[PDB]
């Protein structure tokens, strides 16, 4: 428990050794679609595309590539919104997923803080490889630029708010 | 065919004598050594410290003498992976 740890022990404790933050943590916890997955091709063949990624959206328009998904990242992101208050982020991973996005989920393996048989002797058993970010608190003021970034649309970010602490959007 | 410019230091042969457990021999009285634990870092004190003979003697150093973590980590799955990890550091 004690006497070298990572983030991850630190976090358990601080939940252990008082218990109104730790019933706080559970008020707020406490309250389906077929997508076929791929993007890139419509999108050079009309004009620029020039790299793949969703991080072209973000040099400049998100009209860049397919627009269908243009639909999705406000849609399926809704459906995130009643998910992190029904709980977890672990399902809104698995709907991210759907959302036809590949590495914009993950961000929500982000959230991980570093679970590891390297820094953690209580962690080290329910997982032997390294999990999480060790670099989390350079992660929750990362995404917190995000939660302010006014490219991204409010449909987008809400839950990059709540992600680093939600500021009501 | 040798020709180390920390060898004329005999101050250097008596870090040598000291990094090393002399061994009182029994099939012949004359000494030979029961533990060479003869570090690298007993040259990075007398060599220049410019040049990749110095990069050389500190790669040794990390690799061919060992790093360990000082106080104990309660698994030993634990304790052995922050050995490797000071020495990756």
Same mark, same amino acid.
């Given at each position: 428990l004690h006497p070298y740890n990572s983030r991850g022990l630190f976090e358990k404790k601080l939940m252990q050794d008082n218990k109104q933050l730790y019933q706080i943590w559970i008020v707020m916890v406490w309250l389906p679609k077929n997508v076929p997955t791929s993007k890139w091709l419509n999108s050079? &063949?009309?004009?620029? #595309?020039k790299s793949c990624d969703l991080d072209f959206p973000l040099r400049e328009? &998100?009209?860049? #590539? @397919?627009?269908k998904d243009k639909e999705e990242d406000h849609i399926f992101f809704k459906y995130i919104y009643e998910l992190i208050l029904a709980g977890a982020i672990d399902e809104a991973l698995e709907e991210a997923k759907l959302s036809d996005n590949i590495s914009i989920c993950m961000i929500l393996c982000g959230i991980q803080e570093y679970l590891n048989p390297v820094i953690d002797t209580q962690i080290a058993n329910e997982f032997n490889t390294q999990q999480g970010i060790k670099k989390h608190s350079l992660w929750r003021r990362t995404v917190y630029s995000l939660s302010q970034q006014?490219?991204?649309?409010?449909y987008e970010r809400a839950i990059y708010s709540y992600l680093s602490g939600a500021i009501p959007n | 065919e040798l020709q180390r410019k920390?060898?004329? @230091?005999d101050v250097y042969l008596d870090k040598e004598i000291e990094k090393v457990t002399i061994e009182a021999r029994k099939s012949n009285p004359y000494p030979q050594i029961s533990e060479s634990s003869l570090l690298?870092? @007993?040259a990075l004190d007398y060599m220049?410290? &410019?040049?990749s003979d110095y990069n050389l003697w500190k790669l040794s150093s990390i690799l061919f003498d060992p790093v360990s973590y000082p106080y104990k980590t309660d698994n030993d799955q634990v304790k052995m992976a922050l050995l490797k990890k000071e020495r990756h550091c």
């Open positions: 050079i &063949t009309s004009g620029g #595309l328009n &998100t009209n860049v #590539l @397919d627009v006014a490219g991204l649309d409010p | 920390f060898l004329f @230091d690298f870092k @007993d220049e410290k &410019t040049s």
